[PDB]
Structures are given as C-alpha cells and as structure tokens.
C-alpha cells in the first residue's frame, strides 16, 4: 500500500511513528521501504526490527494472557479469541519472514547485515514456535535453529565478541534453547561463554561501544541468574 | 520469563 | 463485521480484550454489541467507554507528539503524517458519536444511562475540537458544550453530588472549559463547586461508594492545584 | 495537561 511514497519519506515517517509510539504504522512504513528493493542501512535495519518487535511483542503479550485464561478454563469464546490473536501474530511473523526471504537475506553480503537478518529470521520462527502445536511444529523449531546457527557461525568468524548484534544474537539463541528447544544446559552454556568472551574483549572498546556491549551482557547475566 | 534482546 | 456473533459472546470477548490490553479489539466488540440494538447495562456502558477512551487516547497522544514536532518545524512528511493520525482519530470519534446518535441516547430513559451517554457525546466532540481548525470548529465546540450542559442539568436534578458519573462529568466539563472554551474561571468555579458539594455529601456513603467518589474528587483537586 | 476522567 506504500508503493506510491518515496523511500526517504517512508523512512522519515517510520521515525515519526516511533516517536509517536505508533508501531503498527512504523512497521507498515518500514515494510514499504524494504519493498523499494534497495538494501537497508544499519539505522534502517534497526528501525525495521524495532517496529516489528513492538508489534509482535504486543501480540505475544496478549496471546500469553489469553492462553493463561484458556488453561484455567480447561464457552468457545476464550479459545476463539486466542485463536484470532494467534492467527494475527502468525500473519505478522509470515510478513517479516517474507521480507527476509524476498529479498533482504540474499542481498546481504556484509557480515553485519547478514547476521542481523538471520537473527531476525530465527526470532520470528521462534515466535511462530511459541504458538505452534501441529504437524509442522518441529520444522518451525528447526527453522529457527538453522537461522540462528548460520548467524552464529558468521558472527564468530567475522565479528568481535563484543559486537552488539553478535551479543544480541547469542542472547536470543540462548532463549531459544531454554524456552523452545527444552535445552536449558545449552542455553546456560551459550550465555556463559558469550558473556565471558565479551568480558575479555571490553578492553578494546571506546566508552560508547563499551556502554552498548555491557548493556547486552547484563541481559545475559540476568538470564544466568534466573536459570542458575 | 527470560530476557531476549530489547532496547 | 460483528453481526454474526452473539451479543453475550461480544461482551465476553470485550472483557477478554481488556485483560489482554487489546483495546482496538475491545472497541470493535463493544461496537458490535451496541449494534445488536438492545440497551446497555451499567457494566456494559463502562466497557464501551473504556474501550474507545483507550483507542482515542492513544491517537490523541500520538497527535500531540506529531503536532509538537510539526510546530518546531514550522518536507511535507510531518504534516502529512499528523493529518493521517488526525483523520483516523476523527473517524473513531465519528464512530462513537454515531453509536450515541443511533440509538443509545434516544433509548436511554434512566438518568444514569442518559447522563453517561451525554457525557460521552461531550467528550468525543471535545476530542474533535482539540484537532479542529476549519469553518465548523465553533460548531464542534458548541456541540460539546450542549451535550455536557444537558448532562449537567439532568445530573443536578436526578443524582446525588457524589455520584461517580456526575463527578466525572463535571471533571470533564471543567477540562472542556479550561482547554477548549478558553474559560479558565468557569473551569475553576465548576471544579470547586463540584468538589465542595461532593465533600458535604460523603457522610451518606458506604465505604465502597466513598472510595469511588473520593477518587474522582482527587482529580478535581489535582486540576485546581494545577490551575490556581 | 489537566486530568480528565480516567480509570
Ligand atoms: Mg549486497
Ligand atoms: Mg430505555
């Protein structure tokens, strides 16, 4: 629906929507920008991610409220409404995955862009896995795993251990292990090794880079404290 | 319950 | 779009949407319930109000962010996007006003229901007035005034001074005077007289009614402190 | 800036 708007105007409006906390608008603007067909800059990738993370995060929070109510119950209403929110969430995940597949990932040649998009792919398959119950649930989980794994392999070869996207990827892959793959020991081992290797690389960083890296290290620490 | 990446 | 769902199911789903903080869904469910054509209960009126207040409140907050950015600026993007949010907000206000006019108000015979709906009518004309700039802005303001005034006349004849809907109506009419009608002295006089007459009636109340009434009296006090 | 009714 955004085909008639200039790319630069879509980007500018995404930034305005973020300031206005209008994340559905933000996501639609960034979808339109992606569909222009040009690669995304560092800042533009972050806008795309923030927009859809906020949209799907609200849907996930609602699905969890409704799923909890449904479990305490077990009329059709709670199930029906949970299913409605679930379908909407799946639609958003499918939209994001479609943007990644057509054609963000294949055009991403630099490590920073390719890891960013593969992390996104793992995340949105993870969100699909959170609600999945059918014949394809194991394949959804393995799709998340495969995307995260490719991102990890690239990040370990091409980025320093303190790189924020490498750290956030490892954080989210550890959450995948703990919550989705029922592999808490893998989750703990990944978080600990990631934290320790970043700690040993902090000395190389400027004050501003140090702030970015230690912020995500604290999230790894919070999970390790929760898990151990 | 655990924290995934968030800004 | 809700014509095929049972009234009771729409009400139940509105309550679920509120728990899930899915206020757009909540509003759509309550719109469908209203369009069943039966009068609304006390609790159902409150669900309708909460739903649309949350929807339009988000739009108003976004419009204020964008309007502020636009003023600091004065490309077309900020104006265009403010206009988009403004049109969406006006559409929601028109939908609510249409529900009130077809046919909630005309079927509301009891003072409690009629005052409730006339307060809503004043509020949504007030929200239209907040963004209005054209040939009809004075008529929008007078439409808010007339709705609030009729509600006030009924409430003063038919309800005790501590009645929560009477108190909330007077609170919002005072905000109308201060913010919309540029009548701060009228706003202050209304808030003070409302507070004092409620104070003198608290002795008649149960503990639970006392809690409801004093909560809204505190909002009147907060405004008087802001305004004086 | 002033408070209108809110739950
Ligand atoms: Mg390339
Ligand atoms: Mg009647």
Q: Tags for this entry?
A:
A: 228 residues; mainly alpha; Delta-Endotoxin, domain 1; 0% strand; B: 7 residues; little secondary structure; 0% helix; binds magnesium ion; protein kinase binding (chains A, C); 14-3-3 (chains A, C); phosphoprotein (chains A, C)
Q: What's the layout of helices and strands?
A:
The complex is a heterotetramer, with two copies of chain A (228 residues) and two copies of chain B (7 residues).
Chain A: H1 7-19, H2 23-34, H3 42-73, H4 77-104, H5 111-131, H6 137-158, H7 164-180, H8 184-199, H9 207-227
Chain B: no helix or strand
The site of one magnesium ion has 3 residues of chain A, from loops.
PDB class: peptide binding protein
Keywords: 1433, peptide binding protein, Peptidyl-prolyl cis-trans isomerase NIMA-interacting 1
Assembly: tetrameric
Structure description:
- The complex is a heterotetramer, with two copies of chain A (228 residues) and two copies of chain B (7 residues).
- Chain A is built from nine helices and no strands.
- With 228 residues, chain A is mainly alpha-helical.
- With 7 residues, chain B is low in regular secondary structure.
- Helix content of chain B is 0%, strand content 0%.
- Chain B has no helix or strand.
- Chains in contact: A-B, A-C, C-D.
- Chains C and D meet through helix 7 and helix 9 of C and loops of D.
- The site of one magnesium ion (MG) has 3 residues of chain C, from loops.
- Residues 39, 107, 109 of chain C line the site of one magnesium ion.
- The PDB classes it as peptide binding protein.
- Keywords: 1433, peptide binding protein, Peptidyl-prolyl cis-trans isomerase NIMA-interacting 1.
